[PDB]
Ligand binder design. Sequence first.
Ligand SMILES: O=C(O)CCC(=O)C(=O)O
Ligand SMILES: [Fe+3]
Length: 294
Amino acid sequence: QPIIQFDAESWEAEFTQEIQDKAIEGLESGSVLFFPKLNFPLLTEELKFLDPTWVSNISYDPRSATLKGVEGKSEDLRLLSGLLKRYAEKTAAFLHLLFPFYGSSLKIARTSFRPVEISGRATSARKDDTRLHVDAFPSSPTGGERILRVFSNINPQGKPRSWRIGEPFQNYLNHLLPQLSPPAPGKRFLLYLFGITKGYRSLYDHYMLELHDKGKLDLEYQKNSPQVAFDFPAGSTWIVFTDQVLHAVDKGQFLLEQTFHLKVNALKHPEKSPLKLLETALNKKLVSSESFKL
Ligand SMILES: O=C(O)CCC(=O)C(=O)O
Ligand SMILES: [Fe+3]
């Protein structure tokens, strides 16, 4: 079931255990959790930010209270920081209400505001997010940790955000497995020494980047693989492990996004993670820092 719909309409909603179970089982199975009625309202003073000219996308780090990617007057940067900080706070609260099993293992990461219309985008194949992919960032290895994202469509003209959702990760990995290759010896160490990567690119991160890139260049797979097109309405929110769920965006404007990280050993079913699926498929440990279980 690629998309599981929920009725919650508040960021402070209290959930029954049954809904919590549905959410964590769905999330870990690679479903998108969809909240059609969960809107993220803006203050009147923030409405001015609903304009693409503010990008010079925009990112905020809640851990350091630092805003990047935008220039302007102090008071405007304060207002924009306040908007993204509120999105970080509300998404973090919501995830702790919905996923108590993860406890304090949820680690917030960067907040993103995306005011540029998607349908006019055109770039190199590897960063073309109209192509189905799982998330893997060449400059930012994960060391196996999960990439969990919360998304909210805040389009004020009532325009949906058009996604496509692909086949399960295990089928994607199987399709691309004959195209995977090990890294060149010493190359990842040089990327680390040279500051091209933030941290060391694990073998896991190498293979996730290969899946991401080779999947995007596989034009027959992009055209023919199983996929469902879904429009997320304005005023809706959705939650997804974007390292596991194949996704692409086709159209839309004005998105808030919050990234969280989660260690694999905090998952209810760690064997369903991309890390463990890749380690099983290649019969090897793919992250050197891995904790060892006696
Ligand atoms: O902009 C979007 O709606 C999706 C982009 C994407 O692939 C992502 O945030 O991981
Ligand atoms: Fe993505």
